[PDB]
Amino acid sequence: MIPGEYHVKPGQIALNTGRATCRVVVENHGDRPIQVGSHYHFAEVNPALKFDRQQAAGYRLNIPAGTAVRFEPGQKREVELVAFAGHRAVFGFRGEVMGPL
Template sequence: MIPGEYQLKDGEIELCAGRERITLEVANTGDRPIQVGSHYHFAETNPALVFDRAKARGFRLDVAAGTAIRFEPGQTREVTLIPFAGSRHIYGFRGEVMGPLSIAPAPARKSSSGDAANGDPS
């Protein structure tokens, strides 16, 4: 064995085996690329990404830890999401949850720069 060498079993490794999965269509309506990391609360992503945010509440990308998906301007693509596990408490990101996911979401708030996700670019 070489120091630091990985010795893996033959075959495929299935990530998040047996977990619920949902698929959403996501469009980048912005003028810049947007990259979303593996463990980012998908419902709280950049407002220029247009998709069913209510359905994405409590979910993250179904990709390997430490990786990301990039959305180019004008691009529409399907993504697969899996639910957060553990205590299901979400803190940080855009500050839209800040606690347990079991609590109903607060009404949507409008930022000072408008809300492109809801069709208001003002």
């Protein structure tokens, strides 16, 4: 007996189903670590991260909500992106779009 214990049924949950995704190789060219969140507009991340910004347009990281991907200086890795939904209007970040797309 454990007070308030869960009895989670076994299995897995499929996240962000039915949405466009794409893989991109990213490399941290800066001398300081960079960590990106699950819902940040990837095309507007720290300029030190070198990748095809054009392909990442309207995309965010295809990772569980609230988690992040870290890039130590010089680190290169392939990430999977999932496209934004809703109105697909980007406002904020580095201010490169500030509108639909």
